[PDB]
Amino acid sequence: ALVEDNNAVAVSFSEEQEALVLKSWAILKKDSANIALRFWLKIFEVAPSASQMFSFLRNSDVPLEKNPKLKTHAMSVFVMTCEAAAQLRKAGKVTVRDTTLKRLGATHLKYGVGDAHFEVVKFALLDTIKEEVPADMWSPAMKSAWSEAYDHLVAAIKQEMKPAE
């Protein structure tokens, strides 16, 4: 089927699917400061207006945009997506805490984050892993793993953005 999210319906996310999303994260982990610049400059590239939801460039003294509410948020996508994949395999579904997902719902709704923003971030997510990881650990199998993860994350948050069920 093609529903918003599998709340209780059969999602097999194999031990191997999860293995790819962890290992590769671990590689990017090491070069976290740099990749998160290239990840954001890839988003700013596709949809420069997306990077209006934070603020113009002021920290260390350059229009590079070394601001901390980005480096931190870049890490939330990537860490929160790894915690998604990790979840899918054990339970079959995204079960983040109610405070945290209630919280993300209202943040994203307040800042106008639409459907088109979630997908240009996943584009850039995938692209930055493709790009950073060796061409030899990267496969289609690994893009779907992170796709699935992200896809089910964004779906739990988007249901926090509209009224009752």
Minimum gap (Å) between residue 112 Cβ and ligand HEM: 8
Note whether 88 binds ligand HEM by CB under 6 A. Answer: no
Site string (8-27) toward ligand HEM, x via CB under 6 A: --------------------
Q: How far is CA 145 from CA 18, 54, 69, 88, 149, in A?
A: 7, 28, 27, 10, 6
- Pick the stretch among 12-20, 60-68, 113-121, 132-140 that binds ligand HEM (CB under 6 A): 113-121
Q: Which does 115 bind (CB under 5 to 8 A by kind): ligand HEM, a second copy, none?
A: a second copy
Enumerate the known binding-site residues.
55, 69, 73, 103, 107-108
Select the residue interacting with ligand HEM from 85, 113, 124, 126 (CB under 6 A): 113
Contact between 129 and ligand HEM per CB under 6 A:
no
Q: Which of 14, 16, 31, 114 binds a second copy (CB under 8 A)?
A: 114
- The interface with a second copy within residues 36-65 (CB under 8 A) comprises 45-50
How far apart are alpha carbons 44 and 151 in whole angstroms? 21
Q: Which residues bind ligand HEM (CB under 6 A)?
A: 50, 53-54, 69, 73, 76-77, 80, 103-104, 107-108, 111, 113, 117-118, 121, 153-154, 157
